[model samples]
Target: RAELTVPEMRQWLRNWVGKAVGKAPDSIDESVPMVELGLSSRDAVAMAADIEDLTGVTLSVAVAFAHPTIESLATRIIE
Candidate 1:
């Protein structure tokens, strides 16, 4: 199966997080933590679920806290 690239993954994350936070997807910053953008721990789990569904990548719910930023999290998911 083809894997996701970092930029592609980052774009998806921005879209997902922006949808959750009610903002323009492209406006989301990859450098900032999701929690800093107003996501709760519960939201992080939900995001993980979506990632698994989309890519078959099972992220630990704690992944968000560990990686924190979109760039960091996306890199973890991709590699």
Candidate 2:
């Protein structure tokens, strides 16, 4: 098994989140509201799909909603 680094995870997040929110990943901030950051149920589903694709791990919708922050979600993905 291999582990992902924070920078790698952050880069993946930027790609996926940029796609979801219409802003580039570098433009995203951790403290931004998930909803305000352009998250919707539809976006959530898409995000989950993207996360699975990037990390090769399946996550529940509930987990996505609960851990909305990239920092938190990235930690979960690495773990």
Candidate 3:
């Protein structure tokens, strides 16, 4: 299967987070903490699971809390 590129992952994250927070994708700030953007711990866990499903990377639920930003999470996915 073809894997998502880093930029693609970031774009996906921005879109997903923006949708969750009722914002436009262009309004998402990649450097900001996801919690600050209205993501709860529960949301983080769910998002991590979703990422695992999408990428087949088997990430932990805590991955979102640990990374805390779209930029960081996307970087972690590639690493």
Candidate 4:
């Protein structure tokens, strides 16, 4: 099945972040906190909206702070 599972979810998010930060997606680390990704409030919020658009799952702004990384928040998307 082509379900957009964690690996898929994380990679897409990584790619999103990579483009924003001007780093290669593969250069992005799973452990890096979202705040350190050089995302401004509007940018993070846009990421929030788009990921939800992809998965129909919204990460609450505060909750997003808790999740904090591709490794963490990617799991939250399907949870």
Global lDDT scores for all candidate models: 0.85, 0.74, 0.83, 0.85
- For all candidates, the clash counts are 0, 0, 0, 0
Clashing pairs for predicted structure model 3, backbone only? none
**Residue 14 Cα positional deviation in candidate 1, in Å, after optimal superposition:** 0.2
Candidate 4 Cα outliers beyond 4 Å, as residue runs: none
Query: If scored against the real structure, what TM-score would every candidate get?
Result: 0.84, 0.74, 0.81, 0.89
Q: How high a TM-score does candidate 1 get?
A: 0.84
Those runs of model 1 whose alpha carbons end farther than 4 Å from true positions after fitting are none
Ranking by TM-score: 4, 1, 3, 2
Compared with the true structure, model 3 gives a TM-score of: 0.81
C-alpha RMSD for every candidate: 2.0, 2.3, 2.2, 1.2
- Which residue pairs show backbone clashes in model 1? none
Q: Write the per-residue lDDT of candidate 1 for residues 1-79, one digit (tens) a residue.
A: 4667988899999999888889999899889867799777787778888999988988775775799899999898887
Model 3 residue 79 lDDT score: 71
Q: Ten consecutive residues with minimal summed lDDT in candidate 2?
A: 30-39
Model 2 segments more than 4 A misplaced: none
